[PDB]
Structures are given as structure tokens and as C-alpha cells.
Design a protein around this ligand. Structure first.
Ligand code: OLC
Ligand code: OLC
Ligand code: OLC
Ligand code: OLC
Ligand code: OLC
Ligand code: OLC
Ligand code: OLC
Ligand code: OLC
Ligand code: OLC
Ligand code: RET
Ligand code: RET
Ligand code: RET
Lengths: 229, 229, 229
């Protein structure tokens, strides 16, 4: 394997795998029903990302897409990852603040549109249309961030202090990290092609590990995931 | 873009997009938890259909399927739309009548079979087998209509009068509009090829806008979506 | 159709179809809300398997995968079946013992990984990597079996005696039958190629009918699916 980005795919694979194992072992010896929900959701996230990084590392999760008169390597497995992991991450946030079902459905639905349209944009062969899908996806992302900041922050402040403050930290982490993804896509090989694939891959790896394992480390060490005992 | 059906794809795109915006703005300023559920479900429907009409308009959601000794344009994106939107529409109906979970699972499951087998039939290269899948899908549709008429009508009449009467209207709309889809498929380019694709596309566009935006306009203007206040 | 395995695909198709009809008719005349849930879940399982056996029989659910320097017939439709049916079967078990939501999410998630990685392994063109995916999938399966034996058996014994004893029987059936699948894959055409496809197909057919129709016959004749009346 001589793809230059292989090193970042290997490191992502390793870090997701180690993250999954840590959460799995940490979650052993938890009986609180509420805490079990968070452990289950949060452990699945890097477990799924592990499998999809491994598929990229082994070359399964890569296809060639012709656009701009070239054969462009597109790691389609990222979207398969994000389709399942990003709603789980939003579920962690929503459960934390005890969001109502309708809000959860809107968030997960907007998230599916965001990832779905990003995959279409990534596979689209007419260059200028790629950015049409990027814009729709980014609009869906803005909707999600809107809800997290101006709906979830409303109900969280009415929750327990440990819930309010854990939510606020995870909210901020999410807004910052999630916002970088459309930027990397736009400047990387899926978009304008300014940043080469190997650096794009490093950037997504840093984002993915932070948004998944970092997020989970903050969440799962907090007392907000337990019922008041 | 010189595909003659492009005009109907553009109009569908526009009407779904406008529908989505109307529901989104209308749903702003709703705090009732029950009404939020309906707004969320109903707004997602045309939002999803928007993306899939746009994919057809831009040519992404189209493939060529050889059968009957010809290369037949098959808009596969319709099924991707219907897979997600048709269960959401059934969820609107089920929540309205407070259906039990087992009935909801049966309906959504039968609906997945209906769309799944329709997609297989649409992609199948042996001409006579296409109609085998059409028959299975239509049997799944009959099951759904059975449940809506002879199960949901039973519990709705026990609900609030505004729930009973809003359900009955949406039920009738659904049965009529949904029944036309297998007919259009059978006589159109996916089936017997009597009606040319451009007219088939107009017909599905009229059905889709009615079953989604029309449906949602009836539902979201009714008082049945709010708790009794 | 001269594929030698066609006879087992036809018989599986027939037995799933007959199973579905039996459960459908049997479930007519059930009003208990709890029993309705089980009937809905259990009837969907062979209905889905029916469609996917039929797709294999008609040749839709078959692709050719080059590995080991040969064109290998891979029935990919099995995974499409298993992706939806195996979580439904686990849902039957979990509802029986009234498992908490977090445990259900872990089980369904691990199950998706198990089937997802098996499909990747089945489609992978580098021969030695196929067994990497097989090992990950089998690890996910071991996690599921662990939970069923050393978590579900814990709460079931605290349930009604008819629930405890119906669970224990279905648990044992599941562990035995589910464990055979990775073995058949490993020795069959997807793996080491010791057992030819036609015998592999017979083996999966016997397993599938037992794990689905057999399972459902035990479950749906038990009094554990009803509330105490
Ligand atoms: C939190 C613990 C870690 C903290 C740190 C995290 C850093 C993550 C990102 C690094 C970007 C690296 C960018 C490397 C750019 C190399 C550009 C290059 O090689 O340029 C040569 C080219 O020919 C002409 O530009
Ligand atoms: C509710 C507000 C709107 C109300 C109205 C909704 C109408 C929707 C459907 C119209 C079908 C149009 C069918 C057009 C058929 C044209 C056939 C044609 O061109 O035939 C020539 C051919 O060479 C030989 O048949
Ligand atoms: C429960 C009611 C039914 C009870 C019974 C269920 C049996 C299911 C499995 C049978 C395996 C059959 C294996 C057949 C193997 C044939 C091998 C063969 O043909 O070998 C020739 C070859 O050239 C050199 O090995
Ligand atoms: C190098 C190591 C790589 C990583 C290892 C292989 C990953 C895929 C395999 C198995 C998934 C196992 C299940 C994953 C989900 C577990 C959910 C959980 O922790 O559930 C706790 C809950 O409290 C319960 O009731
Ligand atoms: C309640 C839950 C709501 C969930 C809402 C989900 C909405 C997803 C919407 C749009 C994206 C669909 C993208 C589909 C892309 C398929 C691409 C594909 O498979 O392409 C294969 C090949 O390259 C070409 O045929
Ligand atoms: C021309 C315009 C085209 C259409 C616009 C682009 C469509 C895709 C983009 C964003 C989806 C936004 C989210 C869609 C779902 C919103 C759900 C909703 O309304 O939720 C209300 C609920 O009460 C909350 O708690
Ligand atoms: C509880 C929820 C229950 C949900 C129940 C869902 C049941 C779906 C069943 C059958 C349709 C499956 C259709 C799969 C079609 C895939 C076609 C495809 O991707 O084909 C690619 C290419 O053309 C060839 O390899
Ligand atoms: C040869 C025969 C082959 C098999 C027949 C064709 C299979 C696919 C067609 C229809 C699926 C019908 C719906 C399947 C799910 C029914 C769920 C159910 O039984 O629900 C009971 C519940 O109590 C309700 O409230
Ligand atoms: C809460 C619910 C949790 C659910 C957890 C699910 C996790 C699935 C993880 C990994 C498998 C993904 C496998 C994706 C395989 C796609 C293969 C494919 O479509 O390949 C087409 C073609 O052969 C090549 O491009
Ligand atoms: C664990 C991984 C996470 C949190 C991934 C998040 C990914 C995104 C927020 C992706 C967003 C995109 C856009 C808003 C537009 C362009 C395409 C995407 C999919 C990269
Ligand atoms: C918003 C879109 C809606 C309500 C679409 C409904 C679609 C159907 C009821 C499709 C039904 C079909 C059959 C019953 C058999 C042939 C194939 C289908 C998928 C067109
Ligand atoms: C109705 C069908 C059932 C219960 C199918 C069960 C299937 C499995 C437990 C499959 C398991 C696999 C492995 C553990 C590794 C190799 C690949 C699989 C998918 C065959």
C-alpha cells in the first residue's frame, strides 16, 4: 500500500479501535439504565468509525470519480461512517437535555439530508453541481447547529447543573468541530482541490478522532449521564 | 438538459422546495410537543423529496436498465425518496390515531417491502420478472391500505372528533393517491411502456406533490395535531 | 435456470412464503397490544426473507466477485435479508425480557456491524482480507451472544415463569443456529471454498428456515407474548 494517505488511515484505524476498546471496558460495570444508554451510543460511534477507517485503509472504501477531466480518488466510506455516527452523536446530545421526540426527529432527518447530499456531491461527475450539493448539505448543517444553540441550550439550562454544563461544553465542541468538515471538503479533493488528498485525510482524521473519541471522553467521564442517586 | 421530462422534474423540484420552506416557516412558533412531532415529520417529507427531485433534474438519479432489448431510462432516485418519505407519511397517520407500536411496525415494514420490491422490479433485466416484483409490491400496498381502512378507522372513531375527521380525510386522500402509483408504474416506462416517460414523469410529479405537500397542507392546518388545550 | 443450487433457493422461497402466510393468518384475531408487537416483528422476518430468497432464485441477488484468480458467485442478497431480519429477531428476544433501551441499542448496533462487515468480507477482492472482515464480524457476533447469555438470562429469570422459560429455549436455539453461520461462510464459497456453493446454499437454507420460521413457531405458540390476563 503506497497511497501516501495510508499513514493517516492506519492511525485513524488504530485510534478508533483503541477508543472503542476503552469505552467498552469502561462501560463494563455500569448498571444505571440512563448511563447504559450513553455508553451504548457513545461506544458504537468509534466502533463504526473503526470499521470504516479499516475499509479505507484496505482500499475497499475508495472509488474513482471522473470530474474536472481527471480520475479523482473519493473515499466513499466516510459517508457510510457519518451516516450512522453523526445521528448517534446528536442522540447523545438530545438525550442529555431530554429533547422532545419531534426535535430529535428533525435533527436526525436534517442530519441524514446533510450526509446524503454530501455523498451525492462527492460522487457527482459534473464539477459545478458538486458545489450545489455542498451548499444544500451545509444548509442542513446550519439547521442542526441552529437547533443545538437556540433550542437545546434553552431546555438544558432548565436541567440539572451537571447536565447544563456538560451539554454546553459538548455543544461547543460539536459546533466547532462539525463546522470544519464542510470547509475541508470544499478546499480538498472532493471540492476545489487546493489541499491534496493526503493532507485532507490527515485533517479528517484529526476531526474524526476529536469529534468521536474526544467527545466521548468528555461525555463518559461526566456525572450528567447518571440519574441523580 | 434536453430530456423532455426535465420541465416536470424542475417543477417538482420547485414545488417541493417551496413546500418545505412553507412548512418550515409555519412550524416556527410552535411549542406544543405533539404538534412539533407532526411538523417535524411532515416538513421532512418534501425536504427529502426536494433533494431527490433535484437529483433527477441534474441527472444523478437516473440509470439505464436493459430489458425488452432496449436501454431504458430508470429514475432510481424515486425509490430512494419513497423509501424514506412513505413511512414518514404513514407515521403521521398512525400518530394521529395513536396506533399501537405493533401496528406501526407492521405498516412501516410492509411499506419497506413495497418500496424495496418496486425498486427490484424497476432494476430487473428479465422483462416478465419485473411484473412479479410489481405484484409482490402491490400486495404489500394492499396490506397497508387494509390496515388503514379496517384498523386505523376503528381506533380513530374512538378519538377526539377533530382527530377522527382529520384522519378520515387524510385516509381517503392517501388511499386514492397511493393506489394510482402502481397503475402509473405498470403502464409507464418501468412496466408495459404504453405511456411515454415524459408523461409518466408528469403523472408522478402530480401525485408526489399532492401526496406530500397537499397531504401536509391538510394535516398542518388542522387542530387535530395539537393537544387539547 | 440451471444453477445447481436453484432447488434450495426455490425451497427456501416456498418455506419462507408459507411461513409468512401462516403467521399472518395466525396473527389475525389477536388484540393484545403486546402480542401484536411480537406477531408484527415475527411475521416481518420471513416476509423479508421470502423477498430475498426470491431475488436469489430469479438471479437478481447474485453478483460475481473476483478473488483467488476466479469469478466467484456471491449471493449478496443474503446480507440484505440478514441486515433487516437479524435485528428483528434480537428485538423479539429483547422485548420478551423487557431489556432496557441501551442494551437494545448495543445489540442492534453490534448486529449491524456483524452483518455489514460480513458483506464487506463477502465483496472483498483481496483474498486474505476477506478473513479479516470475517474475524471482525465474528467478534461482533460473540458480543451479541455474550449479552444474550450473561445479561438477558439475568433479567429473564426475574420475569414471569412463562417468559423465563420461553426466553431460555429461544436463547439456546439462537446461540446454536447463529453460531453455525460463520462456520458455513468460512468453509463455503465466500471463504476457504471447501464446501461447494450448492451445499453451502442448502446449509444456509436449513439454518435460515430454522432461525426464522422455527424460531417464530416456538415464540408465537407460547403464552409469554401476551400480557397476564
Ligand atoms: C492535539 C494534538 C496535536 C496538535 C497538532 C494537530 C495538527 C493537525 C493538523 C495539521 C496540519 C498539517 C499540515 C501540513 C502541511 C504540509 C504542506 C506541504 O507539505 O507543503 C509542501 C508543498 O509542496 C507546498 O505547499
Ligand atoms: C389540480 C390542478 C391541475 C388540474 C389538472 C391536472 C392534470 C394532471 C395530468 C395531466 C395529464 C396530461 C396528459 C397529456 C397527454 C398528451 C398525449 C400526447 O401528446 O399524445 C400525442 C401522441 O403522439 C399520441 O397520443
Ligand atoms: C430437520 C429435518 C431434516 C433433517 C436433515 C437435515 C439435513 C441438512 C443438511 C444436510 C447436509 C447434506 C450434505 C450432502 C453432501 C453431499 C456431498 C457430495 O455430493 O459429495 C460428492 C463429492 O464429489 C465428494 O465429496
Ligand atoms: C482493535 C480493536 C478494534 C475495535 C473492536 C472491534 C469493533 C467491532 C466489533 C465488535 C463491536 C462490539 C459492540 C460495540 C458496541 C458496544 C456497546 C456498549 O458498550 O454497550 C454498553 C451497554 O451498557 C450494554 O448494555
Ligand atoms: C426519519 C429519518 C430520515 C432520514 C432522511 C434521509 C434523507 C436522505 C436524502 C437524500 C440523500 C439520498 C442519497 C442517496 C445516494 C445513493 C448513491 C448511490 O448509491 O449511488 C450508486 C451509484 O454510484 C449510482 O447509481
Ligand atoms: C429552494 C428551497 C429548497 C428546500 C430547502 C432545502 C432542504 C434541505 C435543507 C435543509 C433541511 C432543513 C431541516 C428540514 C426538517 C425540519 C423539521 C422541522 O420543521 O422541525 C420542526 C420541529 O418542531 C422542530 O422541533
Ligand atoms: C423494521 C423495518 C423493516 C424494513 C423492511 C425492509 C424490507 C426490504 C425488503 C426487500 C427489498 C430489498 C431491496 C434491495 C435492493 C438493492 C438493489 C441494489 O442496490 O442494486 C445495486 C445493483 O443494481 C445490483 O447489485
Ligand atoms: C407465497 C406467499 C409469499 C409471502 C407473502 C408475500 C410477502 C410480501 C407481501 C406482503 C407483506 C405483508 C405484511 C407483512 C407484515 C405483517 C405484520 C403482521 O402480521 O402484523 C400483525 C400485527 O398484529 C398488526 O397490528
Ligand atoms: C444505531 C444503529 C447502528 C447501525 C450500525 C451499522 C454499522 C455498519 C458498519 C459497517 C458496515 C458498512 C458496510 C457498507 C458496505 C457497502 C458496500 C457497497 O454498497 O458496495 C458497493 C460496491 O460493491 C462498492 O462501491
Ligand atoms: C464523526 C464524524 C463527524 C462528526 C462528522 C461530521 C461531518 C460533517 C458535519 C459533514 C458535513 C458536510 C457538509 C456540511 C457539506 C459537505 C459535505 C460534508 C458531508 C463533509
Ligand atoms: C410521496 C410519495 C408517495 C406517497 C409515494 C407512494 C408510492 C407508492 C404507493 C408506490 C407503489 C408501488 C407499487 C404498489 C407497485 C409498483 C411499484 C411502486 C413502488 C410504484
Ligand atoms: C435469519 C437469519 C439469521 C439469523 C442469520 C444469521 C446470520 C449470522 C449470525 C451471520 C454471521 C456471520 C458472521 C459472524 C461472520 C461471517 C459472516 C456472517 C455474516 C455469515
Amino acid at each position: 500500500t503506497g497511497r501516501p494517505e495510508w499513514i493517516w488511515l492506519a492511525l485513524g484505524t488504530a485510534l478508533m479501535g483503541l477508543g472503542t476498546l476503552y469505552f467498552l471496558v469502561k462501560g463494563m460495570g455500569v448498571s444505571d439504565p440512563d448511563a447504559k444508554k450513553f455508553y451504548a451510543i457513545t461506544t458504537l460511534v468509534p466502533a463504526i468509525a473503526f470499521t470504516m477507517y479499516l475499509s479505507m485503509l484496505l482500499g475497499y472504501g475508495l472509488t474513482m470519480v471522473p470530474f474536472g477531466g481527471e480520475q479523482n480518488p473519493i473515499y466513499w466510506a466516510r459517508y457510510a461512517d457519518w451516516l450512522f455516527t453523526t445521528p448517534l452523536l446528536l442522540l447523545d446530545l438530545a438525550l442529555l437535555v431530554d429533547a422532545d421526540q419531534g426535535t430529535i426527529l428533525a435533527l436526525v432527518g436534517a442530519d441524514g439530508i446533510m450526509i446524503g447530499t454530501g455523498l451525492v456531491g462527492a460522487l457527482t461527475k459534473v464539477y459545478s453541481y458538486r458545489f450545489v450539493w455542498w451548499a444544500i448539505s451545509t444548509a442542513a448543517m446550519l439547521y442542526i447547529l441552529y437547533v443545538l444553540f437556540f433550542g437545546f441550550t434553552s431546555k438544558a439550562e432548565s436541567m440539572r447543573p451537571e447536565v447544563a454544563s456538560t451539554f454546553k461544553v459538548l455543544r461547543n465542541v460539536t459546533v466547532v468541530l462539525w463546522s470544519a468538515y464542510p470547509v475541508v471538503w470544499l478546499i480538498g479533493s472532493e471540492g476545489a482541490g487546493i489541499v491534496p488528498l493526503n493532507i485532507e485525510t490527515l485533517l479528517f482524521m484529526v476531526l474524526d478522532v476529536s469529534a468521536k473519541v474526544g467527545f466521548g471522553l468528555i461525555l463518559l467521564r461526566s456525572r450528567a449521564i447518571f440519574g441523580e442517586a
